[PDB]
Design an enzyme around this catalytic site. Structure first.
Site, PDB file in Angstrom:
ATOM      1  N   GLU A  35       0.712  -1.102  -0.190  1.00  0.00           N
ATOM      2  CA  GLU A  35      -0.012   0.132  -0.083  1.00  0.00           C
ATOM      3  C   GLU A  35       0.714   1.295  -0.125  1.00  0.00           C
ATOM      4  O   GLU A  35       0.578   2.169  -0.873  1.00  0.00           O
ATOM      5  CB  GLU A  35      -1.186   0.022   1.202  1.00  0.00           C
ATOM      6  N   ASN A  46      -7.636   8.959  -5.632  1.00  0.00           N
ATOM      7  CA  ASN A  46      -8.380   7.951  -6.562  1.00  0.00           C
ATOM      8  C   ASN A  46      -9.506   8.761  -7.889  1.00  0.00           C
ATOM      9  O   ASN A  46      -9.503   9.916  -7.552  1.00  0.00           O
ATOM     10  CB  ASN A  46      -9.407   7.002  -5.571  1.00  0.00           C
ATOM     11  N   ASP A  48     -12.092   8.674  -8.478  1.00  0.00           N
ATOM     12  CA  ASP A  48     -13.523   9.403  -8.067  1.00  0.00           C
ATOM     13  C   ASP A  48     -13.225  10.527  -7.158  1.00  0.00           C
ATOM     14  O   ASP A  48     -14.240  11.031  -6.653  1.00  0.00           O
ATOM     15  CB  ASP A  48     -14.198   8.255  -7.312  1.00  0.00           C
ATOM     16  N   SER A  50     -12.191  10.646  -4.176  1.00  0.00           N
ATOM     17  CA  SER A  50     -11.214  10.385  -2.899  1.00  0.00           C
ATOM     18  C   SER A  50      -9.806  10.262  -3.077  1.00  0.00           C
ATOM     19  O   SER A  50      -9.164  10.193  -3.966  1.00  0.00           O
ATOM     20  CB  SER A  50     -12.007   9.222  -2.157  1.00  0.00           C
ATOM     21  N   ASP A  52      -6.508   8.303  -0.700  1.00  0.00           N
ATOM     22  CA  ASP A  52      -5.718   7.120   0.330  1.00  0.00           C
ATOM     23  C   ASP A  52      -4.849   7.660   1.034  1.00  0.00           C
ATOM     24  O   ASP A  52      -3.632   8.525   0.526  1.00  0.00           O
ATOM     25  CB  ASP A  52      -5.689   6.031  -0.529  1.00  0.00           C
ATOM     26  N   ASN A  59      -9.026   5.152   2.971  1.00  0.00           N
ATOM     27  CA  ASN A  59      -9.747   6.089   2.056  1.00  0.00           C
ATOM     28  C   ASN A  59     -10.783   7.039   2.443  1.00  0.00           C
ATOM     29  O   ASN A  59     -11.491   6.599   3.454  1.00  0.00           O
ATOM     30  CB  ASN A  59     -10.308   5.102   0.852  1.00  0.00           C
TER      31      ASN A  59
END
Length: 129
Positions: A35, A46, A48, A50, A52, A59
């Site tokens: 990660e 991301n 969309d 959002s 992380d 997220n």
């Protein structure tokens, strides 16, 4: 902060993550490796909108507030910046909530695609724990 592999293992154990919800410490270290490469400051946007955050790439769509993720929640009741700290406590407490949400560690797509079913003990091999 960029942790060493055994250093992170030890800190995850210190905060109660080893065998949490049945996931051995090697699973959590492996997830962190893919990660964030063990970097607590890791952030990734991301598609969309959002983002992380942190060593376990948590997220903002569900788990933390960053003020720029419309219609999202904050189920760990924390600012997403808290997940970037050198101290992993906030990331560990939030990860405990996420892994309890129903799908276990599948919530971490890199865990599912790169750790699940592999020899995850190798991530703690040789560590003094």
């Amino acid at each position: 902060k960029v942790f060493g592999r055994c250093e992170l293992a030890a800190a995850m154990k210190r905060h109660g993550l080893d065998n949490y919800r049945g996931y051995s410490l090697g699973n959590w270290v492996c997830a962190a490796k893919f990660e964030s490469n063990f970097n607590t400051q890791a952030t990734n946007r991301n598609t969309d909108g959002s983002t992380d955050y942190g060593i376990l790439q948590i997220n903002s769509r569900w788990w933390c507030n960053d003020g720029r993720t419309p219609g999202s929640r904050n189920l760990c009741n924390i600012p997403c910046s808290a997940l970037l700290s050198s101290d992993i406590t906030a990331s560990v407490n939030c990860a405990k909530k996420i892994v309890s949400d129903g799908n276990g560690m599948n919530a971490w797509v890199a865990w599912r695609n790169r750790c699940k079913g592999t020899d995850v003990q190798a991530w703690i091999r040789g560590c003094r724990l």
